[PDB]
Design an enzyme around this catalytic site. Structure first.
Site, mmCIF file in Angstrom:
data_model
loop_
_atom_site.group_PDB
_atom_site.id
_atom_site.type_symbol
_atom_site.label_atom_id
_atom_site.label_comp_id
_atom_site.label_asym_id
_atom_site.label_seq_id
_atom_site.Cartn_x
_atom_site.Cartn_y
_atom_site.Cartn_z
ATOM 1 N N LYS G 33 22.954 -2.864 58.557
ATOM 2 C CA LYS G 33 23.651 -3.812 59.410
ATOM 3 C C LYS G 33 23.816 -5.177 58.774
ATOM 4 O O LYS G 33 24.595 -5.989 59.280
ATOM 5 C CB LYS G 33 22.921 -3.963 60.741
ATOM 6 C CG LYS G 33 23.005 -2.731 61.611
ATOM 7 C CD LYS G 33 22.358 -2.966 62.954
ATOM 8 C CE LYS G 33 22.363 -1.707 63.796
ATOM 9 N NZ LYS G 33 23.728 -1.317 64.213
ATOM 10 N N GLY G 47 27.494 -4.168 68.129
ATOM 11 C CA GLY G 47 28.539 -3.599 68.963
ATOM 12 C C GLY G 47 29.222 -2.438 68.274
ATOM 13 O O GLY G 47 28.563 -1.502 67.828
ATOM 14 N N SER G 129 22.099 -5.686 71.907
ATOM 15 C CA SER G 129 21.663 -5.197 73.204
ATOM 16 C C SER G 129 20.218 -5.563 73.495
ATOM 17 O O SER G 129 19.890 -5.938 74.622
ATOM 18 C CB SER G 129 21.820 -3.681 73.274
ATOM 19 O OG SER G 129 20.919 -3.053 72.383
#
Lengths: 204, 199, 191, 215, 201, 213, 220, 191, 215, 199
Positions: G33, G47, G129
């Site tokens: 990421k 996302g 999240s």
């Protein structure tokens, strides 16, 4: 869903010095099957295959467009294609339809063109690459193949145990699966040779 | 709704359409023809929205005639099948999609007989015998009961008559007369028109 | 629309505008928005008109009956409980902006609030109505603990004045109420 | 504009003997909150005609901009020709109609008052392009409220003086202050004669509340 | 889901599959669908498990009450009528039930078909479920009245094999029940794979 | 607006042995993208020869558990004897159809001994049907667990593999393997494991941890 | 997905957890990421995975072009401007939750991007999240001008709290330290979750599966 | 959220809260809600964030280019006109809470407002934002014509203080901006 | 209640050695307007148990009423037997389930804290009847926000002291004051021991804003 | 949907339904009977939701016989028709309506033969020739040009034949077999089953 309109189940598994990709044989509309000979695994060069699952229209269309760009690449440059190059190509082709999306989940399984390094990866319906080391799956059924491969996979596998492990996983997960069944085709490739077997799956 | 059935043999393809052109209550035309002789060894059947069927006849028929007149040699059935599949797959995602159901009957000098199977979502298929509508179900059952790849043509005509006699007993449609073709080493030979008095 | 109750040491001071609107048309230019229930207890209402009228009449019924059976002057918190029960039980159909105030022999002046939900709280000052938010903007700035009666009257005068001036639904005329141990003194500021 | 944000309110206009008087108020309400209680809602076009609008104030600014441009263009031609008020009425109607025909309507309700060459003119333009002439115009709720007063006195007397018309406008605006929730006690009168265009100041009304002493 | 039933000279044949999925997911391969109501009645499970199960159990209870009151076995048509009357009272409230009522009567062979829509009808052949049309095809090929015992067994077994071969919502073991004049008897319970090896050539 | 259901997830396993019923369950209670606890054992020990597990919507699980305990006591206080396993199964089926038109959103697995003294696992469904199977995996991890049990319990899709009866300890290590392998890929599984063993001598419980994420 | 950002006394420490699930099932155990942009600037995504990937590669291409055309080290603010302009041009259709950090000649600069195009400069951000647990740990124990090891321990602690809350990762944490001079990038930082050993060799024997059709194709 | 602009004789005074929220969660505790465009002109924004950021950038671009082509300091009304055009042009898609102020050499201090529609008006004081109705309740109560600089600072301090105290979306910390002929004076306060 | 009008916000409770501390704030916000900034959201039940709630305040008043009635009734039995906290937990759970079964949900999220007979207790009750025991409870956004602090310290140390717990609650409430839009800097701490139930006064927090001097 | 015709004569009523009991694709039962012999001169036909048909026949057929036993004689066709209409009109405004399409065929001693015509909204009608379903769009115009009030029964049976011949020519449903009744001074007499071999 729309991914479960024609079914589909592709498994690819990395062995020790070899890689094995397997798929189902069934093709049909939502519950009414048609034929058992529908090809979902394509040869893209030598010692490197692609598998496709989902809507069969997008399957054949993506396979032919990829073949188009692949031939153009290999004729501009005399060498054959490396797996990361193909992965970026498939990602670019899918992401061109960011908002008119093809409904497919490609699976690339192949070897190194210089060494015997194995390779597996999968992509999402918009072009998200994901490389791992153990196995990747796609299609309607997922959790079944996840459970089986997380149950049975060992890191360093001679091609026979690799073949038998992907065999048991595909057979059990497809027999629990409803809309995708009716036979198994298994490609087990390595540096020396290419083997293609079909299993005695339950025709139920 | 209606259905046009096609069987594969050793050296022949036994296709069989209907002759029904009904509109929502009544049979307007009782001798309709849904058989499109593309070339000397390639047939085509079509089922779906009837504004689209005539224009597929137009497009594919006249374009394969264009190919024949341009080059000098008739198409293979396989290339014709792929060309139709490609044209449907292109016309699918537009403001004007075409919603038909095809199946292709051809015969090559080298590949021999071939039978393909489309969809309204443009999927190729290489099948021994096909299905659309509901004649789909009530033909495929018996037709998969009695099949041999080494079946002679009169056995196939007998099987098809028997299958039609099973059809005219548990539908809710009417389907009086079925037109039938055959493809051989020579060409498209029309068989006799197969209708049935019911009771 | 905009209703307001403020207590001081001796008693309480109430107040409201007049205009009952429907859509963008005014049906009634001048309205008794505040209602006598007992002779020492008022309530001013908002939201729907018919709902609050019916609820106030039922409270008048039960409270007068209960007060006669006690043969004693009623409490303010009791009428607060009655509006609380009538609102909360048969809610989901009502729009109650009920503010209970009044002087009590045991407890002096008290002010209770009942919003559209049905909760009951005791406050020292209160707003109510759609055009109450603005003077709720500064009622927590201008207020000083321990006012006299004239200070409360001038206070509510400025408050309802700016409420009528700024919001479109408010307007009309100012009606004030002064409830204490002594009597009930109502007056109408106009123009 | 699909959703009008900042509405004005009713605009009153009536002819008289050799002139037209228009008066609208100065309120810029949003929702129910009178957010802009000091704005101008009458444009003084060059020398004869004169515009007053309701609805979305921003669209009225836009039309102010375009018409000011057009009038300055024709004056800079130097040919001695101006626009009639009726030509303005025609152009505005065509503009509104072509704007709604593309399904992007201008939320407005406009009155064009002009006096040119002996004849008074008093025109109306709706959002849909509905347009006509009238001896008296009332927009918004004014067509419900003050329009019977105009049609009572004009049926009682077909011509008027400037004084009578101005008084009648005052009374109608008082009535609108009584029973319109989107009203405000500050309005401006605009008047055209052959002496030019004249906009009066922010006048107010005188109210009565003696009914409130009744129960 | 594919069930069928047909009566003939030597009684009634009832066979069914045993696959009961859940959406796209198979729950079990061995769901015994032909619910054994009585020692003289046999009921099915056609659309929904719980509804078929519950209402046929209630019908069994009702019939046992009837027999104990009259010292006499109930008819087949009577049970079909009772089931139709009980099911009809929940019309539109979302019951799916398409079962079949089989058994031997004082008149003899009896074959009724009761829907949750209440289509109570007699008949000679029936087939219920998703792949029912396939059974209709191959059965009305092979059907007669004058069939033998082993012939009827082969007809029903071949029918369920073809139905599970074409449709996806059917599979598992193929049960096989046989109503005689006096009592019903389970013939056999065969797997699809055994039949595939046996009948493919 | 108000939705009357919410998905809590969970995983219940059952294995019908020769003379044993093993029911195991994790103790994670979650909701959406949160963790409510790490201790909520889904299993419940009714009689000395009956253990029930309940997953799905948790409040309906609690209510159903209490109603089953109440009807157990009613049967005992009326008929001077404990229920069987299948009687409990039939009673639960009657209950689940008795709330047909406002269903329980609850998966249920009753294990326990029969009157012969053999293993007996009775599966269920929200609407109230049941059957006597040899193993079921209930809750969120059903598809991750059914094919591995099909390979190991059923010996299915195998060739020349003879049938050994499943012993106790081999089943124990099977349960431990399947819960680790299922807790790797599933989100609604982990943080404990409550293993219940029904013998001819009582009920044994056993707690083995997992990965804490 | 829980990415975090912080600014210590010299530069930026970025962290991530790398479980990319698809729906309800853990699809991945190792997903990078933390992406490359430039030798001085990195980025993290949240996302929609492929949208973040394609957007961050496009911006990195444009910045490499602009830097090679200029001939000096790039600026964080230009990356910020390109990202916000592009994402505002897509009208918020493309869901890309971005954290942008890099060290310019002016020093450390951290930006959080919300996918409509709203950007903020902050000394610490959390996105994703499970971002709230890391925001909790930051708002607990942040102080300005922390040290190197202090900030590394802090970011590890925050993402560990995110992993003990839901939708963290079995992946052990990815970290990254950007300074004025030293760029580091650390994939296997600290493993809390050892997978338990197998309790049984469930080995498929050589011949337990019936074969219908074999085929051999030699190669070179 | 809540933005506040007052002019006085020498210049103008701006002011805002910070607390950029997304739903019920605060994403940003501290936010530069006021934006420099030219060296003498600010704009404070509300509504959505990304819309106002992109609009502020485009206005900054066009205005700086225009002011360099004049080789003269820009007007404030020019920037107000630019916001008016670019907000009325895309009014179907934006949520503009723009308030422009700034000192001018020709015109002194001025304040223009741009609400969500695209109308442009000149005011002597201005509210803006969702938590602005309350201080809009008393900004016509406490304001006196002809203040000093310090009176405007204290005034807007009380304004934004009560807005942050009462409304739930507002809060955080106060940012003030002093614009005059002399310079640009910004400060951060709490109290 | 389909539509909660006046909501509270998150409640925090945690056990320690021989006691349970519960603390919530004193805010009555409607929509976003903090309309009732002085309310009590904690009932001190008789001697052992103690209640804290969220959601609609009217439903909290109702349950407060009904529980007070029942506790008074058992105290008027005069037998010496009381309610255990877990009994109250059971009754409240059955009450909430009976409400939601009839499509009339009581919009709440309630926390029960009690200490009886050597053993502490900290119960949770949802609107949907989801109810369990826990070493540390957090409602509303607290289950996202302050729950990791609780689960960090309780994992790093299983038991606590009263002072550690009280300080930790103060820190968690400070954090909830930092990043929650429906929060307010006024809260009360309520603590049960074997020595009884005690509600502390309307305490407040110490804030920090030194990040704002950065750009 | 299906079909049933209702021709009146001078002293006879000639009704004829079909024998079709299909379910949406397939014809489940091809000898079904929709006829409910109420009394010795009163017949009843029903069309509609097949859960309602059997129920409403079960109501009327088991209430009119109760009237017969109680009073010692037989209803008029008129009163029976009105009684059915009354029960529909009462059942319509409830939580459980019936959706049926009846026609009643009776024979009085005094009124002689009689035909009524129901509808799913409970309307009485005294028709000379009624039908129902989709067939009813054709088969009334096939009839209204060859109807004579004083027509003999053999002409009527011939006209049935002439009409069914035009039914099975232009109609999408199958409808192979029609059963035929007749009423006279004696009672209900069943004529032979009228089927057709089509081709």
């Amino acid at each position: 869903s729309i991914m479960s309109y024609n079914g589909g189940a592709v498994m690819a598994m990395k062995g020790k010095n070899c890689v094995a990709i397997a798929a189902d044989r069934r093709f049909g509309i939502q519950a009414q099957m048609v034929t058992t000979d529908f090809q979902k695994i394509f040869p893209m060069g030598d010692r490197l295959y692609i598998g496709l699952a989902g809507l069969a229209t997008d399957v054949q269309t993506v396979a032919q467009r990829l073949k188009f760009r692949l031939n153009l690449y290999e004729l501009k440059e005399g060498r054959q294609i490396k797996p990361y190059t193909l992965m970026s190509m498939v990602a670019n082709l899918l992401y061109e339809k960011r908002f008119g999306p093809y409904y497919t989940e490609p699976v690339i399984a192949g070897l190194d063109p210089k060494t015997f390094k194995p390779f597996i990866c999968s992509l999402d319906l918009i072009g998200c690459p994901m490389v791992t080391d153990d196995f990747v799956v796609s299609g309607t059924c997922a959790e079944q193949m996840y459970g089986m491969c997380e149950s049975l996979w060992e890191p360093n596998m001679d091609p026979d145990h690799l073949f038998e492990t992907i065999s048991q996983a595909m057979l059990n997960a497809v027999d629990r699966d409803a809309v995708s069944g009716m036979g198994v085709i298994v490609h087990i490739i390595e540096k020396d040779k290419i083997t293609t077997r079909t299993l005695k799956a339950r025709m139920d | 709704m209606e259905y046009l059935i096609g069987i594969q043999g050793p050296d022949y393809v036994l296709v069989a359409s209907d002759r029904v052109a009904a509109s929502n209550i009544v049979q307007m035309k009782d001798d309709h023809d849904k058989m499109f002789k593309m070339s000397e060894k390639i047939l085509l059947l079509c089922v779906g929205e009837a504004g689209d069927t005539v224009q597929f006849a137009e497009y594919i028929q006249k374009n394969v005639q264009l190919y024949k007149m341009r080059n000098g040699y008739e198409l293979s059935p396989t290339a014709a099948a792929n060309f139709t599949r490609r044209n449907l797959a292109d016309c699918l995602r537009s403001r004007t999609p075409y919603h038909v159901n095809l199946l292709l009957a051809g015969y090559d000098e080298h590949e021999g007989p071939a039978l393909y199977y489309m969809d309204y979502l443009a999927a190729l298929a290489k099948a021994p015998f096909a299905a659309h509508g509901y004649g789909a179900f009530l033909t495929l059952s018996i037709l998969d009961r009695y099949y041999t790849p080494t079946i002679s043509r009169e056995r196939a005509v007998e099987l098809l008559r028997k299958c039609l006699e099973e059809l005219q007993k548990r539908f809710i449609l009417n389907l009086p007369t079925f037109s039938v073709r055959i493809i051989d080493k020579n060409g498209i030979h029309d068989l006799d028109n197969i209708s049935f008095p019911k009771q | 629309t905009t209703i307001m109750a403020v207590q001081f040491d001796g008693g309480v001071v109430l107040g409201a505008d007049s205009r009952t609107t429907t859509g963008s048309y005014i049906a009634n230019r001048v309205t008794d928005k505040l209602t006598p229930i007992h002779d020492r207890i008022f309530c001013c209402r908002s939201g729907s008109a018919a709902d609050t009228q019916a609820v106030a009449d039922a409270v008048t019924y039960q409270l007068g009956f209960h007060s006669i059976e006690l043969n004693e002057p009623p409490l303010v918190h009791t009428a607060a409980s009655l509006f609380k029960e009538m609102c909360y039980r048969y809610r989901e159909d009502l729009m109650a902006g009920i503010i209970i105030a009044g002087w009590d022999p045991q407890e002096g002046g008290q002010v209770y609030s009942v919003p559209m939900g049905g909760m009951m709280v005791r406050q020292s000052f209160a707003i109510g109505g759609s055009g109450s938010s603005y003077i709720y903007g500064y009622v927590d700035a201008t207020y000083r603990e321990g006012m006299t009666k004239e200070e409360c009257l001038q206070f509510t005068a400025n408050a309802l004045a700016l409420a009528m001036e700024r919001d479109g639904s408010s307007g009309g005329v100012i009606r004030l109420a002064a409830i204490a141990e002594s009597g009930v003194e109502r007056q109408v500021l106009l123009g | 504009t699909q959703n009008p944000m900042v509405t004005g309110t009713s605009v009153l206009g009536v002819k008289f003997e050799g002139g037209v008087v228009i008066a609208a108020d100065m309120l810029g309400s949003y929702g129910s909150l009178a957010r802009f209680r000091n704005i101008s809602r009458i444009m003084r076009v060059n020398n004869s005609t004169m515009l007053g609008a309701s609805g979305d104030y921003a669209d009225f600014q836009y039309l102010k901009q375009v018409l000011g441009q057009m009038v300055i263009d024709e004056e800079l031609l130097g040919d001695g020709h101006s626009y009639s008020p009726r030509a303005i009425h025609s152009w505005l109607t065509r503009a509104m109609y072509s704007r709604r025909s593309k399904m992007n309507p201008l939320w407005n309700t406009m009155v064009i008052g002009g006096y040119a060459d002996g004849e008074s003119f008093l025109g109306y333009v709706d959002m849909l392009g509905v347009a006509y002439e009238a001896p008296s115009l009332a927009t918004g709720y004014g067509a419900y409220l003050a329009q019977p007063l105009l049609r009572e006195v004009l049926e009682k007397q077909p011509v008027l003086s400037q004084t009578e018309a101005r008084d009648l406008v005052e009374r109608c605006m008082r009535v609108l202050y009584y029973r319109d929730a989107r009203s405000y006690n500050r309005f401006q009168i605009a008047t055209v004669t052959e002496k030019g265009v004249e906009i009066e100041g922010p006048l107010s009304t005188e109210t009565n509340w003696d009914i409130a002493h009744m129960i | 889901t594919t069930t069928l039933a047909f009566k003939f000279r030597h009684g009634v044949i009832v066979a069914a599959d045993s696959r009961a999925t859940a959406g796209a997911y198979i729950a079990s391969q061995t769901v015994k669908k032909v619910i054994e109501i009585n020692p003289y009645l046999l009921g099915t499970m056609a659309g929904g498990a719980a509804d078929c199960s519950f209402w046929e159990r209630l019908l069994a209870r009702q019939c046992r009450i009837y027999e104990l009151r009259n010292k006499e076995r109930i008819s087949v048509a009577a049970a079909s009528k009772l089931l139709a009357n009980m099911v009809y009272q929940y019309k539109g409230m979302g019951l799916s039930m398409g079962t079949m009522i089989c058994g031997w009567d004082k008149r003899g062979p009896g074959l009724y078909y009761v829907d949750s829509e209440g289509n109570r009808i007699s008949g000679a052949t029936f087939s219920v479920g998703s792949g029912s049309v396939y059974a209709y095809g191959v059965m009305d090929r092979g059907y007669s009245y004058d069939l033998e015992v082993e012939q009827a067994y082969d007809l029903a077994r071949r029918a369920i094999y073809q139905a599970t071969y074409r449709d996806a919502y059917s599979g598992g073991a193929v049960n096989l029940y046989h109503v005689r004049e006096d009592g019903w008897i389970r013939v056999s319970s065969d797997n699809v794979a055994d039949l595939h090896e046996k009948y493919s050539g | 607006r108000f939705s009357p259901y919410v998905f809590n997830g969970g995983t219940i396993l059952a294995i019908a042995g020769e003379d044993f019923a093993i029911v195991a369950s994790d103790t994670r209670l979650s909701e959406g993208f949160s963790i409510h606890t790490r201790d909520s054992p889904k299993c419940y020990k009714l009689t000395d020869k009956t253990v029930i597990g309940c997953s799905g919507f948790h409040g309906d699980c609690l209510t159903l558990t209490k109603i089953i305990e109440a009807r157990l006591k009613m049967y005992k206080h009326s008929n001077n004897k404990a229920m069987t396993t299948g009687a409990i199964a039939a009673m639960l089926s009657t209950i689940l159809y008795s709330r047909r038109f406002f269903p329980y959103y609850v998966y249920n697995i009753i294990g326990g001994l029969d009157e012969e003294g053999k293993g007996a696992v009775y599966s269920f469904d929200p609407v109230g049907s049941y059957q006597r199977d040899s193993f079921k995996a209930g809750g969120s991890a059903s598809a991750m667990l059914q094919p591995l049990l099909d390979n190991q319990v059923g010996f299915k899709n195998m060739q020349n593999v003879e049938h050994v009866p499943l012993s106790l300890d081999r089943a124990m290590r099977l349960v431990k393997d399947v819960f680790i392998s299922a807790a790797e890929r599933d989100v609604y599984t982990g943080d404990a494991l409550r293993i219940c063993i029904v013998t001819k001598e009582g009920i044994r419980e056993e707690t083995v941890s997992l990965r804490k994420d | 997905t829980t990415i975090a950002g912080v600014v210590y006394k010299d530069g930026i420490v970025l962290g991530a957890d790398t479980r990319a699930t698809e729906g309800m099932v853990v699809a991945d155990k190792n997903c990078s990421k933390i992406h490359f942009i430039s030798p001085n600037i990195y980025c993290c995504g949240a996302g929609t995975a492929a949208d973040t990937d394609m957007t961050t590669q496009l911006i990195s291409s444009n910045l490499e072009l602009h830097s090679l055309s200029t001939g000096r080290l790039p600026r964080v603010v230009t990356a910020n401007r390109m990202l916000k302009q592009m994402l505002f041009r897509y009208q918020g259709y493309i869901g890309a939750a971005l954290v942008l950090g890099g060290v310019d000649v002016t020093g450390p600069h951290l930006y959080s991007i919300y996918p409509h195009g709203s950007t903020d400069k902050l000394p610490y951000v959390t996105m994703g999240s499970g971002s709230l647990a890391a925001m909790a740990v930051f708002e607990d124990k942040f102080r300005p001008d922390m040290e190197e090891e202090e900030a590394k321990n802090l970011v590890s602690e925050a993402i560990a709290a995110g992993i003990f809350n839901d939708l963290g990762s079995g992946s052990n944490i990815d970290l990254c330290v950007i300074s004025k001079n030293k760029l580091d990038f650390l994939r296997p930082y600290t493993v809390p979750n050892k997978k338990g050993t197998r309790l049984g060799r469930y080995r498929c024997e050589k011949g337990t599966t019936a074969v219908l059709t074999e085929k051999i194709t030699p190669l070179e």
